[PDB]
């Protein structure tokens with residue numbers, strides 16, 4: 001209810017407020033507006049203050065990070081914005097500022113923003129099978145994750161972008177180690193491994209234990225990385241069509257190149273509904289269930305929309321199956 005019209009880059013008090021909740025419509029904003037949101041997060045979380053980040057260097061770094069993201073259907077800058085915004089949402093919801101140090105908060109946020117830098121739009125499975133430069137460079141060990149990670153520190157290496165320029169070397173080393181651990185923890189090949197490791201520490205969780213906290217941070221970045229279905233139905237749905245577009249781009253290339261095609265990327269096998277029912281039930285729900293053990297507030301805010309979505313895709317599945325029989 002402002003007295004005058006302000007530019008799009010000058011976020012309204014309403015936008016600033018809405019940004020703290022996972023209900024935030026990530027689709028309503030252009031890159032420059034999304035960049036202003038990310039900037040606000042760093043200031044609001046006290047990261048600019050506590051780490052003596054130069055405000056112009058923060059903006060310069062964010063702009064560079066944006067430039068280093070590719071125009072892929074799913075693995076684009078908007079995805080990186082979701083992950084970071086969900087991380088920001090979880091810092092407030094779970095009251096992470098109480099349990100975690102500002103260094104940990106800086107790690108969680110910086111890694112969330114950087115996690116998919118210069119993604120080619122073709123998964124590790126393609127990279128390895130196609131014997132790409134990345135696969136040969138990283139010896140088939142999480143090539144993409146290692147690359148996003150490498151690109152992240154290559155950006156921060158540039159003086160005009162170094163947001164950690166005023167952080168002592170000992171501090172920088174800690175942030176670097178943490179960010180690396182987190183960005184590499186995003187590889188879905190390690191999901192089962194990371195989940196089992198966290199569930200083991202769950203038996204008697206200790207916030208004063210470094211090993212426990214590292215696994216929690218890993219689980220948190222993983223939560224934000226795949227958190228699309230947690231968001232309202234209208235916000236969550238367009239992302240599934242985005243992922244399918246990127247997956248079909250790969251499966252077509254894999255078919256053309258004579259390489260094996262993943263069934264969940266296969267045009268004649270994958271369904272928007274069937275893929276989501278499985279992902280929500282067996283990947284999304286169990287992961288958020290263990291987070292709820294530490295943070296009960298996650299159930300009402302994040303498990304409830306996941307249950308709602310599972311039930312909807314199950315309803316949609318019945319319609320698709322009926323329609324596909326007529327097409328046969």
Ligand SMILES: O=c1[nH]c(Cc2ccccc2)nc2c1cnn2C1CCCC1
Nearest residue numbers: 188226228229240243244264275276279
């Ligand atoms: O919400 C999702 N559903 C599915 C499941 C799925 C959806 C559509 C087609 C095929 C699978 N997969 C997902 C989602 C989010 N990220 N990912 C992947 C994990 C590694 C990066 C991409």
Ligand SMILES: [Mg+2]
Nearest residue numbers: 115116186187
């Ligand atoms: Mg990734």
Ligand SMILES: [Zn+2]
Nearest residue numbers: 115116186225
């Ligand atoms: Zn990702």
